[PDB]
Amino acid sequence: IDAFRLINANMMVLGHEPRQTTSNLGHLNKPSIQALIHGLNRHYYSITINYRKNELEQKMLLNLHKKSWMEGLTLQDYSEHCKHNESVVKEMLELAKNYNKAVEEEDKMTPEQLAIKNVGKQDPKRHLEEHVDVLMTSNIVQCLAAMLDTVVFK
Amino acid sequence: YAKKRGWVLGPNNYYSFASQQQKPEDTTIPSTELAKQVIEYARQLEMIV
């Protein structure tokens, strides 16, 4: 969304949106190539947009949309929870099959710390722990969620 | 042993007192301390920050 505003054609020998009072008018709008071909800046000009955000309108906007009551203390229904963990262990199994050869062959053949294993690769030590990262957050929460109701619900 | 402890000689029979209790039912004491052990994992999966 953007707002525009016509400028008069008589003042085309002097400034068009002249008279720099501030210096905040440069990073609030950067006209792209598709904008400066039709009317910018010889016909009209652009204008800056901020959002009037206040209280009892903005806080209650999020106090009703992204809220919950029982979502924290609710089980993930193990019919598909531990079924989901089967297809996560098996795929990091294959990435560990991929990881065994890859680094040790690269280091023992040439120590260049460089080419095609640097320019177009994807199997580093960035890919193998994020599956471990998902598998912890999905289960440490799910373990501890089943610990509260043992105490709370008798 | 009869004057200090039991082992009372009656009709040619001693009597040593004995009983046993029963506790497999308490999931509640591994409820609180396990909840401590799971959180102190997740406390330490971060915090060198």
Curated annotation (Swiss-Prot), chain A:
Q: Which residues carry this modification: Phosphoserine?
A: 68
Q: Which residues carry this modification: Phosphothreonine?
A: 110
Provide the tissue specificity: Widely expressed. Highest levels in heart and skeletal muscle.
Q: Per its UniProt entry, which superkingdom is the organism in?
A: Eukaryota
Annotated coiled-coil segments of the chain: none
Summarize subunit and interaction data from the UniProt record for this chain. Component of the 19S proteasome regulatory particle complex. The 26S proteasome consists of a 20S core particle (CP) and two 19S regulatory subunits (RP). The regulatory particle is made of a lid composed of 9 subunits including PSMD4, a base containing 6 ATPases and few additional components. Within the complex, PSMD4 interacts with subunit PSMD7 through their respective MPN domain. Interacts with TXNL1.
Q: What does this protein do?
A: Component of the 26S proteasome, a multiprotein complex involved in the ATP-dependent degradation of ubiquitinated proteins. This complex plays a key role in the maintenance of protein homeostasis by removing misfolded or damaged proteins, which could impair cellular functions, and by removing proteins whose functions are no longer required. Therefore, the proteasome participates in numerous cellular processes, including cell cycle progression, apoptosis, or DNA damage repair.
- Family under the similarity heading: Belongs to the peptidase M67A family. PSMD14 subfamily.
Q: Please report the name of this protein according to its UniProt entry.
A: 26S proteasome non-ATPase regulatory subunit 14
| Gene for this chain | PSMD14
Swiss-Prot record, chain B:
- Disulfide connectivity for this sequence is none
Assembly and interactions? Component of the 19S proteasome regulatory particle complex. The 26S proteasome consists of a 20S core particle (CP) and two 19S regulatory subunits (RP). The regulatory particle is made of a lid composed of 9 subunits including PSMD8, a base containing 6 ATPases and few additional components. Interacts with DDI2. Interacts with TASOR.
> Which family does the UniProt entry place this protein in?
Belongs to the proteasome subunit S14 family.
The task this protein performs is described as:
Component of the 26S proteasome, a multiprotein complex involved in the ATP-dependent degradation of ubiquitinated proteins. This complex plays a key role in the maintenance of protein homeostasis by removing misfolded or damaged proteins, which could impair cellular functions, and by removing proteins whose functions are no longer required. Therefore, the proteasome participates in numerous cellular processes, including cell cycle progression, apoptosis, or DNA damage repair.
How is this protein named in the record?
26S proteasome non-ATPase regulatory subunit 8
The organism encoding this protein is Homo sapiens
User: Could you tell me the gene encoding this protein?
Assistant: PSMD8
